[PDB]
Design a protein around this ligand. Structure first.
Ligand SMILES: O=c1ccn([C@@H]2O[C@H](COP(=O)(O)OP(=O)(O)O[C@H]3O[C@H](CO)[C@H](O)[C@H](O)[C@H]3O)[C@@H](O)[C@H]2O)c(=O)[nH]1
Ligand SMILES: O=c1ccn([C@@H]2O[C@H](COP(=O)(O)OP(=O)(O)O[C@H]3O[C@H](CO)[C@H](O)[C@H](O)[C@H]3O)[C@@H](O)[C@H]2O)c(=O)[nH]1
Ligand SMILES: CCCCCCCCO[C@@H]1O[C@H](CO)[C@H](O)C[C@H]1O[C@@H]1O[C@@H](C)[C@@H](O)[C@@H](O)[C@@H]1O
Ligand SMILES: CCCCCCCCO[C@@H]1O[C@H](CO)[C@H](O)C[C@H]1O[C@@H]1O[C@@H](C)[C@@H](O)[C@@H](O)[C@@H]1O
Ligand SMILES: [Mn+2]
Ligand SMILES: [Mn+2]
Lengths: 291, 291
């Protein structure tokens, strides 16, 4: 939120008030947050706005135990598609620093390897990211980046993922549930859990694999989710979908300022390529669950 | 931007991703700013969000010379429709403090009468609002309100105008031009003016009668428009639409974070009640121009 200088002259098509960009999908939430789909944004305008602020984006990714194998494709495709032209700082959290592949980066981009402990259960590995993002890295992130983007590693970039996502707080629509009614969402349904959401509440089902925002908002979210997980652990309960359950509770009670469409987290294997998706931007890589 | 506590449990209809709110109009700009139309927002959610921040809204209005006659209806209808339930501070700028009508206010609402000089030409009266809002009232507004809303007085509220409009910076689509191509917009077209916009630039034509934002953003806008008007005056040129021309230049170069639809500034006399308007919220009162 620093003083913003004027945009230069730009030549682009006039937005027309009586022509929607997209008529097939919801492009704004009932709390007036944009839902980001292809056709809703002019990337040239957004790139100008964010470049004029010299925006730095941090990207966090965890690669613990066998998941180090996903890093090469993840990082090489991020170089092709993630925030190209902007300052990027990758933060790779791993138990095997020597297994991080040497990936060639474009100018203005850097990578830090952060060693962490590996936990036995994949559920605990997934869940402990909230603590790792918040408690350990609070001060570093505040000094080094403007926004944090927190993603799964078992993924590849296939198309543009850029500054259109940046906002104080965002979540991403889970690709399996964007057409589902709220009663069908796999929220935590046990009232004994901090993640509990009743059947008559819920806006969306957000996937735990892609969330972000300003550093302050991300530290708030990760701190709250970590605290809620600790309460659950003390009470002998583990939410049905782990960190994702808590993320969903948080974003129900603290509405995101943008929502990313499932373009931003897709599984083509599983779900194909429906008409509503004009681009598949960030997609699941096969993982043979029982990695 | 203070710490935001959690929303309470709320029961409301689920937003459905594959059902747009409105298919007849553009509801988001190409820079991802919501365009505020009826059907795009859930006021209960927004009221909760803004009440939890104890939001105070300042409303500025100028009533100089014969325009004091418009104050009674303006203020009485604002009491019925403007930010009801929230803290409101009216700032009435006038050359005739004794002519301000005694209007009964709801709880949490206050009115201040600010005496100013009357200028001879209606164009100068209109134009000098930018200076009056910025230079004179900078410190007061920063201490007293969170958002400023700056409107014409020759108007009445007929329907809800609430926290859905609040954002760092907003303008309102001029009711005569929302369907027009940019070449038809009455921007200042002389390159000798600071307000100059070429025929191949422009997003929208914003009306000078309804704009606002955070206090900081409004002071930035009003300061920039005042400075630009002073440059024009020194160069012997007066923009075709005065302050409105400068407002349009500013919002071209500094994109608003929400845009209000013409629901928010309408003239039923002149334009009727088209199908695209589900509500007429803030409307022109007859003024017999040659007042
Ligand atoms: O042995 C492991 C297990 C997990 N992870 C990390 O944890 C992430 C999440 O695990 P998976 O990708 O195996 O799980 P899913 O793809 O099923 O994940 C979805 O469900 C999870 C909760 O069960 C999380 O919320 C996750 O973010 C969401 O995308 C991985 O991408 C990886 O970054 C590891 O590094 N090593
Ligand atoms: O003698 C006057 C003349 C003007 N005004 C103030 O200036 C405002 C703007 O003047 P008008 O309402 O007469 O002009 P329009 O309705 O045609 O205004 C439109 O065009 C103007 C520029 O020409 C401004 O930009 C204005 O905000 C925009 O709504 C008035 O509402 C009032 O608040 C007075 O108080 N007294
Ligand atoms: C074959 C598995 C199909 C799974 C569909 C549901 O996906 C799962 O939904 C969970 C919440 O209900 C949670 O988000 C995990 C999610 O599964 C992950 O994401 C899917 C899209 C697939 O990529 C799957 O392999 C992955 O484990
Ligand atoms: C009869 C007059 C019709 C005017 C249509 C155009 O309205 C004017 O447009 C100007 C910019 O081109 C500027 O905004 C003034 C605006 O006129 C004002 O707003 C109109 C909608 C009417 O309410 C009019 O009376 C008012 O003066
Ligand atoms: Mn995954
Ligand atoms: Mn007017």
């Amino acid at each position: 939120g620093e003083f913003m200088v004027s945009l230069p002259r730009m030549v682009y098509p006039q937005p027309k008030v009586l022509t929607p960009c997209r008529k097939d999908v919801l492009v704004v939430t009932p709390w007036l947050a944009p839902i980001v789909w292809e056709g809703t944004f002019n990337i040239d305008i957004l790139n100008e706005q964010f470049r004029l602020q010299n925006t730095t984006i941090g990207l966090t990714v965890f690669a613990i135990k066998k998941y180090v194998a996903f890093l090469k494709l993840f990082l090489e495709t991020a170089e092709k598609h993630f925030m190209v032209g902007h300052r990027v700082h990758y933060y790779v959290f791993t138990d095997q620093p020597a297994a991080v592949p040497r990936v060639t980066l474009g100018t203005g981009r850097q990578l830090s390897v952060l060693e962490v402990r590996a936990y036995k259960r994949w559920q605990d590995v997934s869940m402990r990211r909230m603590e790792m993002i918040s408690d350990f890295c609070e001060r570093r992130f505040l000094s080094e980046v403007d926004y944090l983007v927190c993603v799964d590693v078992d993924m590849e970039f296939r198309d543009h993922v850029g500054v259109e996502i940046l906002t104080p707080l965002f979540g991403t629509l889970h690709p399996s549930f964007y057409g589902s009614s709220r009663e069908a969402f796999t929220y935590e349904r046990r009232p004994q859990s901090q993640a509990y959401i009743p059947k008559d509440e819920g806006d969306f089902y957000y996937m735990g694999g892609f969330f972000g925002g300003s550093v302050q908002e991300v530290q708030r979210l990760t701190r709250a989710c970590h605290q809620a997980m600790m309460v659950d652990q003390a009470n002998g309960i583990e939410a049905v979908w782990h960190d994702e359950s808590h993320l969903n509770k948080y974003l129900l009670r603290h509405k995101p300022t943008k929502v990313l469409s499932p373009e931003y987290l897709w599984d083509q294997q599983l779900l194909g390529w429906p008409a509503v998706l004009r681009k598949l931007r960030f997609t699941a890589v096969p993982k043979n669950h029982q990695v």
